[PDB]
Design an enzyme around this catalytic site. Structure first.
Site, PDB file in Angstrom:
ATOM      1  N   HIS A 145      -6.146  -8.257   1.124  1.00 45.15           N
ATOM      2  CA  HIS A 145      -4.992  -7.462   0.870  1.00 45.15           C
ATOM      3  C   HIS A 145      -3.731  -8.300   0.281  1.00 45.15           C
ATOM      4  CE1 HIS A 145      -2.275  -4.154  -0.420  1.00 45.15           C
ATOM      5  NE2 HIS A 145      -3.425  -3.364  -0.512  1.00 45.15           N
TER       6      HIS A 145
ATOM      7  N   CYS B 127      -4.363   3.082  -1.937  1.00 43.63           N
ATOM      8  CA  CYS B 127      -4.710   2.157  -2.812  1.00 43.63           C
ATOM      9  C   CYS B 127      -6.157   1.708  -2.430  1.00 43.63           C
ATOM     10  CB  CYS B 127      -3.955   0.670  -3.004  1.00 43.63           C
ATOM     11  SG  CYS B 127      -3.367   0.229  -1.520  1.00 43.63           S
TER      12      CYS B 127
HETATM   13  N1  LIG Z   1       2.429  -1.200  -3.119  1.00 46.35           N
HETATM   14  C1  LIG Z   1       1.157  -0.900  -3.417  1.00 46.35           C
HETATM   15  O1  LIG Z   1       0.076  -1.754  -3.551  1.00 46.35           O
HETATM   16  C2  LIG Z   1       0.970   0.439  -2.985  1.00 46.35           C
HETATM   17  C3  LIG Z   1      -0.392   1.039  -3.072  1.00 46.35           C
HETATM   18  C4  LIG Z   1      -0.822   2.325  -2.946  1.00 46.35           C
HETATM   19  C5  LIG Z   1       0.131   2.889  -2.502  1.00 46.35           C
HETATM   20  N2  LIG Z   1       1.453   2.584  -2.028  1.00 46.35           N
HETATM   21  C6  LIG Z   1       2.212   3.564  -1.322  1.00 46.35           C
HETATM   22  O2  LIG Z   1       3.319   3.941  -2.184  1.00 46.35           O
HETATM   23  C7  LIG Z   1       4.437   4.257  -1.469  1.00 46.35           C
HETATM   24  C8  LIG Z   1       5.574   3.272  -2.086  1.00 46.35           C
HETATM   25  O3  LIG Z   1       5.252   1.900  -2.097  1.00 46.35           O
HETATM   26  P1  LIG Z   1       5.911   0.661  -2.708  1.00 46.35           P
HETATM   27  O4  LIG Z   1       4.926  -0.322  -2.479  1.00 46.35           O
HETATM   28  O5  LIG Z   1       6.327   1.133  -4.102  1.00 46.35           O
HETATM   29  O6  LIG Z   1       7.189   0.611  -1.694  1.00 46.35           O
HETATM   30  P2  LIG Z   1       8.621   0.149  -2.278  1.00 46.35           P
HETATM   31  O7  LIG Z   1       9.538  -0.299  -1.042  1.00 46.35           O
HETATM   32  O8  LIG Z   1       8.397  -1.095  -3.199  1.00 46.35           O
HETATM   33  O9  LIG Z   1       9.307   1.185  -3.022  1.00 46.35           O
HETATM   34  C9  LIG Z   1       9.575   2.352  -2.118  1.00 46.35           C
HETATM   35  C10 LIG Z   1      11.296   2.950  -2.826  1.00 46.35           C
HETATM   36  O10 LIG Z   1      11.554   4.142  -2.106  1.00 46.35           O
HETATM   37  C11 LIG Z   1      13.055   4.142  -2.099  1.00 46.35           C
HETATM   38  N3  LIG Z   1      13.579   4.992  -1.000  1.00 46.35           N
HETATM   39  C12 LIG Z   1      13.414   4.718   0.092  1.00 46.35           C
HETATM   40  N4  LIG Z   1      13.604   5.744   1.064  1.00 46.35           N
HETATM   41  C13 LIG Z   1      13.998   6.786   0.156  1.00 46.35           C
HETATM   42  C14 LIG Z   1      14.700   7.949   0.314  1.00 46.35           C
HETATM   43  N5  LIG Z   1      14.799   8.873   1.378  1.00 46.35           N
HETATM   44  N6  LIG Z   1      15.202   8.461  -0.879  1.00 46.35           N
HETATM   45  C15 LIG Z   1      14.836   7.947  -2.000  1.00 46.35           C
HETATM   46  N7  LIG Z   1      14.587   6.642  -2.442  1.00 46.35           N
HETATM   47  C16 LIG Z   1      14.079   6.289  -1.172  1.00 46.35           C
HETATM   48  C17 LIG Z   1      13.417   2.547  -1.830  1.00 46.35           C
HETATM   49  O11 LIG Z   1      14.665   2.281  -2.121  1.00 46.35           O
HETATM   50  C18 LIG Z   1      12.108   1.956  -2.766  1.00 46.35           C
HETATM   51  O12 LIG Z   1      12.800   1.443  -4.100  1.00 46.35           O
HETATM   52  C19 LIG Z   1       4.102   4.041   0.079  1.00 46.35           C
HETATM   53  O13 LIG Z   1       3.900   5.373   0.516  1.00 46.35           O
HETATM   54  C20 LIG Z   1       2.995   3.031  -0.078  1.00 46.35           C
HETATM   55  O14 LIG Z   1       2.196   3.057   1.034  1.00 46.35           O
HETATM   56  C21 LIG Z   1       1.673   1.364  -2.415  1.00 46.35           C
END
Ligand SMILES: NC(=O)c1ccc[n+]([C@@H]2O[C@H](COP(=O)([O-])OP(=O)(O)OC[C@H]3O[C@@H](n4cnc5c(N)ncnc54)[C@H](O)[C@@H]3O)[C@@H](O)[C@H]2O)c1
Ligand SMILES: NC(=O)c1ccc[n+]([C@@H]2O[C@H](COP(=O)([O-])OP(=O)(O)OC[C@H]3O[C@@H](n4cnc5c(N)ncnc54)[C@H](O)[C@@H]3O)[C@@H](O)[C@H]2O)c1
Ligand SMILES: NC(=O)c1ccc[n+]([C@@H]2O[C@H](COP(=O)([O-])OP(=O)(O)OC[C@H]3O[C@@H](n4cnc5c(N)ncnc54)[C@H](O)[C@@H]3O)[C@@H](O)[C@H]2O)c1
Ligand SMILES: NC(=O)c1ccc[n+]([C@@H]2O[C@H](COP(=O)([O-])OP(=O)(O)OC[C@H]3O[C@@H](n4cnc5c(N)ncnc54)[C@H](O)[C@@H]3O)[C@@H](O)[C@H]2O)c1
Ligand SMILES: [Cl-]
Ligand SMILES: [Cl-]
Ligand SMILES: [Cl-]
Ligand SMILES: [Cl-]
Lengths: 325, 333, 334, 334
Positions: free
Chosen positions: B178, B151
């Protein structure tokens, strides 16, 4: 000589409170985490403040005020190299699971949670006399029971309770998610971002009151509302009594039962004023309401508690009393 | 036939990705995979504490959610090898779990039968990192697994691109302020990855934490390689963030020249703001980065200039929209 | 003969100032003034959402509070020149209302017969401004109105002094990540001073806002005059802050050299921290500034260096202790 | 053949949202707003809102006016309503949303300035009729000049309380509203204008007990509940969105299903019915004045004696605003 399984919120604060205690001392802790992380979280606390003492990490132990405490990182309680185990993991909340600490080497055990109906359940200051020492696993109930029980007992003894409904307006806890995400136990409301929401959630404290106060068995129920404060809570009870009462008599009876476990408050306090108190329950005379409609009375009474520190001190008072037997 | 997308990890990014693809033409989500029964996922899709109720119909079925009438198959397999992407004709996987963030792990989706993967996080250096609006032209079509960066990188990159092209950057230090995220604890507790600062209660603290975003600008814009670094401060807002860059430029600049250059570069990805906004005004925006001209400062002391430029982003929705743009470009090429 | 202090504005700073002065020897608060009945002030002195219960006794009397058994007269006069400062023999007024933050306005207290005023805020460019531990020697006691600067200046100044003395500063840009304060609204609403960002709900927003702490640094550290500027980001914590300074130094430096020089300059005003702490760990500290060696960054690109140094502060208690240190030093010369 | 011309006094949380809602309404339009602030600040807060989102429409500034969706709305900043040009502008109704004119003699200033009718966005005292739209608006006979749309809690409680009264009979009940904090609470611990020791405390840090007359006002909105209900509030750290619990003794036996079926049967544009596992933020921006939550219904029977808890959600901002607008349109049509 005590030992702490689960160095979480309850486990770490227990060590802080036992550090002030005589005749029992924390000799070891067990968790799922390396000692450096446990030491840091013991020293620094977002809601309970910095630890008032020295704490450094030695080889395989932590040194608190000069004395060494061994640290272990095992998720199997039977494999613990163990007098009383404070069970604070949240994962061994019955006799069968808690029996595993006994087969690890240790004698007695206090579960820092409801421990089922097959284990004696004590709210210190209400019914600790029901213990005779021969017990192996006991329960100190939940934080809410320790808040509810002294208030409810006074209502039962002095007026008698027909029935009552409880609402605990509760600080959010670690079983809620930081942001909206799938929840481990399938609770659609605890899945929601904890610091953004009023979150309805169920609780058994009022329904299970009969374990602490038999003469209230089956007379109370209720539910919870989790709100965005990181610690500090209150319990409202709306009840129908068996004889007429006034707000003044109700408050006067509350004050008469006040002790180190049950505080009495008349100031216009709010939840943050309650962070870190050592009463298991703090009755709030300013919120008592007796409403009379054509002779019929409906009563609201409110008690505060720090769901962290209030419960921890009750856990320690009960732990001390149990050791003297 | 639409481009068929599968979402792995129906989390913050995964669920919003579904929302945005629903409004897009030519592409549709065919399946989502997570660790959860469909009832829990459907609920989180309909109801969102920061992004609002889902604006559409969403119903529960037997192992599926029905979104705007269309059935979306729901799986709960933690091993991406075993997902029926081939059986379902999936074209692109949005890898959003946070657990398959490198080339070999994300190739499990291609072995499962999908043609392409986009990792919603940094994916290592042997995977091309694309910030849409800055460097998507580097794709030549032969890639199977790519990354949409972090992000913060999507926020910093267009701002740094303008400074480099218009003035040249000697060096710069970033501070991203952040929103807290799910990798921080609700209350003080052990942290899975050993981070003593992410272990602390998220909504109670200013929490310093490291980030590789400024270093990775060196990959999205090669002429900035080795020139930027920085760090993060996590603060108690549930979403919405900003990135500050303090830089030494190679040529003299004024506040007006910098702001005019930012505005000239504005696009669907890079917004331009002149109002006195705060972070909640940024929740749900679709720019990958929103430059804030009101915070531009060029300080001149004895001829030496030190420059601060600031851009907002919704670390959730801003990133999601960059992720979807990259997905569409990558699926076409 | 004890030094008699009055507090005008029994707010966040005013009330914490009483707590700290209570622990001091040779100086005592004789009176407080606000716009409020005594019961409300007593209540707020006893109960504090971020700083905890008062560790002492506090009871109400007739238009007065009794703290640890001693009577402190309470007034509610909104016009400070009508206060009986001369009659009570008040030596120093702590001006903490936020409404008399320049020499002309604060001189009301001298007109009311107090001998000295310390403003708990920047007091303009024409009053001596003191960060205790950096420049209290500029005081000779003959001053009547002085300034203890802002919370951020007390954080910034000791850190910037070490950088100036040990390496020389070409220029620097500051960012303070700051707790929200009472000049922001609870919810989005018109703002009294016309600030479109302080109008927004304090506990929901990252709120950019201006600050003169770095720009005015030349009043505390003369060799940094005109060499710094910066700005603030208000974020939803109720107290506790940090200050980042990104600077260009005059000679090369390493993070270890920077950190060693900070530790070498540490004192009761300037703390040195090496743990992985967060803002709530800083609530209630008594350092005016707590340097964080874990955040030091020296970035070298083709020989050119850019430096980041970061210090924490409890914008409430850190500043309050600095104010009382300055007060005690100022009273020992007055 | 003229649209109903509205003035808004107090461009606050309710005032600004009322404008949003009236912009979407047919037959009624805002002709002017008045506050204590320059137009630039009012425009800014109209466009940008921390809890309700960006205004979905065009909004630009002009010479002492805002232009909303192309139409000019005059802006004034006079704090005495007598002097407002309500007559000169042909103002039919004033939405009185300042919180400073919540009784009849104070609100009648808008009539003396040339307006025809006034709706107070709060309890207005007992010589002003109190209307919860969908429960008792028929009590208006047209001859009223000043009316009240009650409080947010009264609008939440009333439809829920009406079903229980009509379908089962109510003996007595106690209310607890778990309520979002509002602008009458301080950002941080500080003296409170009205002397309330709990509303003096930091709003986003505390569970704050506070009194409310909402349950008593039900006895005025629903006369067959006169003298039967009371209750109080706990303000908690969410910036908007609330719920009201009622614990009551009924006159006839009831089950959870009967209570819920009757609530669903009475649902309308004003009274919503919910069966999902929602939390407070799901309620932000809803247009129901009350949203009944069947998932929280509890009937407890102990030896034949029954005690009943029913709970309804409300956005104390948007839910009340939409109730305010419905009442306005109905009142304006007479
Ligand atoms: N939240 C943000 O602001 C943001 C911004 C940019 C990038 N990201 C990236 O996006 C990715 C997801 O972030 P998020 O904030 O949505 O996290 P999150 O925890 O909200 O969502 C991750 C999801 O993946 C699922 N999960 C975990 N392991 C799994 C597996 N082996 N198989 C299937 N499902 C599985 C979990 O149950 C969960 O619902 C990360 O790599 C994060 O760094 C997040
Ligand atoms: N948190 C409260 O307010 C509160 C109040 C009353 C009662 N309780 C009860 O106390 C118990 C602990 O709750 P908490 O508040 O300490 O939560 P927590 O999450 O802070 O505590 C659990 C701790 O134990 C560790 N742990 C987990 N599983 C373990 C295992 N198998 N072996 C060893 N260590 C393990 C965790 O890593 C964590 O440090 C629960 O039963 C809870 O219901 C909590
Ligand atoms: N809060 C901080 O973090 C902080 C830090 C450093 C300096 N300061 C400065 O200290 C001053 C006070 O700030 P605060 O946060 O304590 O504010 P505050 O709002 O909490 O306290 C101000 C107090 O002064 C009273 N007051 C207002 N006008 C008055 C008058 N005319 N006469 C008497 N009393 C009056 C108010 O009723 C209130 O009790 C300001 O100049 C502020 O910028 C504050
Ligand atoms: N906030 C809610 O949830 C809620 C719900 C229902 C009803 N209400 C009631 O609505 C009223 C307004 O509440 P609010 O939350 O919008 O408060 P607010 O503080 O946000 O709005 C009040 C507005 O009126 C302005 N104002 C004050 N005095 C004035 C004067 N003399 N002349 C002109 N303008 C003046 C203020 O500048 C401010 O913009 C109150 O009576 C409140 O109880 C509030
Ligand atoms: Cl219930
Ligand atoms: Cl850095
Ligand atoms: Cl700046
Ligand atoms: Cl009550």
């Amino acid at each position: 000589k005590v030992a702490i399984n689960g160095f979480g919120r309850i486990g770490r604060l227990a060590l802080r409170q036992i550090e002030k205690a005589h005749g029992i001392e924390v000799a070891a802790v067990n968790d799922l985490t390396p000692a450096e992380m446990l030491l840091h979280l013991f020293k620094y606390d977002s809601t309970q403040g910095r630890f008032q003492g020295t704490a450094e990490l030695k080889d395989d132990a932590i040194v608190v005020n000069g004395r060494e405490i061994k640290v272990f990182a095992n998720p199997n309680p039977e494999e613990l190299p163990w007098d009383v185990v404070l069970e604070c993991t949240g994962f061994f909340t019955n006799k069968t699971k808690a029996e595993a600490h006994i087969r690890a080497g240790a004698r007695k055990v206090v579960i820092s949670a409801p421990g089922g109906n097959d284990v004696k359940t004590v709210v210190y200051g209400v019914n600790q006399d029901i213990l005779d020492g021969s017990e192996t696993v006991i329960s100190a109930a939940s934080c809410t029971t320790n808040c509810l029980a002294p208030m409810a007992a006074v209502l039962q003894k002095e007026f008698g309770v027909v029935e009552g409904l409880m609402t605990t307006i509760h600080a959010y806890t670690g079983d809620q998610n930081t942001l909206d995400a799938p929840h481990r136990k399938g609770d659609l409301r605890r899945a929601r971002a904890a610091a953004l929401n009023i979150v309805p959630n169920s609780t058994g404290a009022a329904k299970a009151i009969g374990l602490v106060i038999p003469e209230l068995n089956g007379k109370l129920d209720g539910s919870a509302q989790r709100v965005p404060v990181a610690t500090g809570s209150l319990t409202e009870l709306v009840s129908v009594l068996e004889r007429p009462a006034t707000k003044e008599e109700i408050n006067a009876a509350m004050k008469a039962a006040s002790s180190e476990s049950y505080g009495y408050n008349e100031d216009q306090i709010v939840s943050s004023d309650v962070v870190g108190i050592e009463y298991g329950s703090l009755f709030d005379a300013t919120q008592t309401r007796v409403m009379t409609v054509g002779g019929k009375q409906l009563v609201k009474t409110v008690a505060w508690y720090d769901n962290e520190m209030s419960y921890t001190c009750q856990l320690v008072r009960t732990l001390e009393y149990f050791a003297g037997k």
